[PDB]
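forwarding from the other thread:

> can someone predict this with zinc ion?

sure thing
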Amino acid sequence: MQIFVKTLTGKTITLEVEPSDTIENVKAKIQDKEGIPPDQQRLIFAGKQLEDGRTLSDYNIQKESTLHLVL
Amino acid sequence: MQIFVKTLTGKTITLEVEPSDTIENVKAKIQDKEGIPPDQQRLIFAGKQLEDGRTLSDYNIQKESTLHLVLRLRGC
Amino acid sequence: MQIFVKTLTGKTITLEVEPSDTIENVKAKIQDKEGIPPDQQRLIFAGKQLEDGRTLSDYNIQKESTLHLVLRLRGC
Amino acid sequence: RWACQSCTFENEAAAVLCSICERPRLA
Amino acid sequence: RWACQSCTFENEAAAVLCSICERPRLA
Amino acid sequence: LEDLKQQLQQAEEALVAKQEVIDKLCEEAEQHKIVMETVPVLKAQADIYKADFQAERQAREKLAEKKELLQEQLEQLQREYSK
Amino acid sequence: QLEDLKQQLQQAEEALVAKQEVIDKLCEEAEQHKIVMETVPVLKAQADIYKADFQAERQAREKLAEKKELLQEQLEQLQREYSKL
Amino acid sequence: QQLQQAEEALVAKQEVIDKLCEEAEQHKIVMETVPVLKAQADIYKADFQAERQAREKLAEKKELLQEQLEQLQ
Amino acid sequence: QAEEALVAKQEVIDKLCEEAEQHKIVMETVPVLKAQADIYKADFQAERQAREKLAEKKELLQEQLEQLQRE
Ligand SMILES: [Zn+2]
Ligand SMILES: [Zn+2]
């Protein structure tokens, strides 16, 4: 499915991911298509930080979700 | 798709956007092309000010639509 | 064609213009090379003060003609 | 209500200047 | 608790800065 | 009466006159911004021409000193060829 | 309905004063700009002076050079007409 | 009472602005070269157009003379 | 009254980050201006050389107009 990542500057980026993709994988997709290093990426939703080792299905990411990117 | 942004100074800029883009994403594109800070940008369409949380589809903005760019520069 | 604009301080500037140029355009050329804002510029030719809207042919200003430039003090 | 001639914003009839670009109603 | 107005992180009440973006509580 | 609406319509027309002045002044102000932006480049040019000038003068002073010495040499053996 | 115009015209009068305050601000800024733009012709004149003086020093350095080369060949020829004498 | 945490952290942010101003001054030194490079470019462009102007008038004089040889032959 | 000066510091920092981005733009143009200056110098030197070669190839050919002047 296609998801959106929300930045501090009001920019929203579109990503092609797999439900089996890790948070590390999403950061790798951001690096490959947007050039943002995965080491600086910190994903936040509902006051919860996503950990590198877990996948998208681990965090119960539902439909119409918007992710937050903190550097 | 192309959309147009006309300024008060007679300059018109052409943008390539998608209807799913936010107003903040459009303001970022305005800064990228003309260096205009997004905090000073106010975009008007059909007599309505465009809100940051809405999409282009929210305002039914189709291709080759023309938005009006109001700034805040010292109030000319 | 080339014309000359004499000031009251003994300085003469040379301009490349065309008979179809407006007085407003000539004052812009004077601003470009001398930095004088056109609102200060008052152009005199043959004892007559020129109006911005007219052309050089309207005042029958030919090649190598000499205009006099009086500078304002204020502006606003 | 009146639409601004500069930025097309439709202001209330009471508005003297446009609420957004502040240019007069008749400009 | 307070939710950060830039990244929506829900911080502890005693937190002065956001734990992830370090922006102040009232920013 | 209706003269109150006449007072308002008069004020609205005077606001158009002020916006005219503001628009002319801001249109002129952008041109002033352009001319003022040229000043530091013109200052840099003057510094460049002063440098090139002083360099050529210093080199000329050195060359002129060398030539005058050669004049003293030709005049020396011309004062010594007298033999 | 008229009392809304007292809430209207009073706003229009306040807006005219605001516009005039903006105008007076712009006019003051323009007089401060005129100082800088008046430095423009001064620097253009300085550059013309330094460029003219440089071109003079160039031309002088050239005519001096071939003068010195002529003094050289005249000198070395005197060396010949001397060691042979 | 996070005042000590806040009183220390505000000193930490003031340390951040100290670094930003120091780097800003180092940048200002580098940015000062821009007008010199612009002025130098404008000079060489003028000198080039001066040489090209002179060469055009030379070529027109030669082509007129080479025409005088073509006719006088 | 904890943010009384903390938000003020963040405001000064943010305006300095915008200043930093503008500085990074100007310094990014610097080597381009230098390359432009060196190019204009080369094209100028080449145009002077090409002019002198032309002045020779014509003023020398002026002797040919004196050759066909004997007839
Ligand atoms: Zn408006
Ligand atoms: Zn945060």
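The first helix of chain A runs from residue 23 to 34. thats all i got for now
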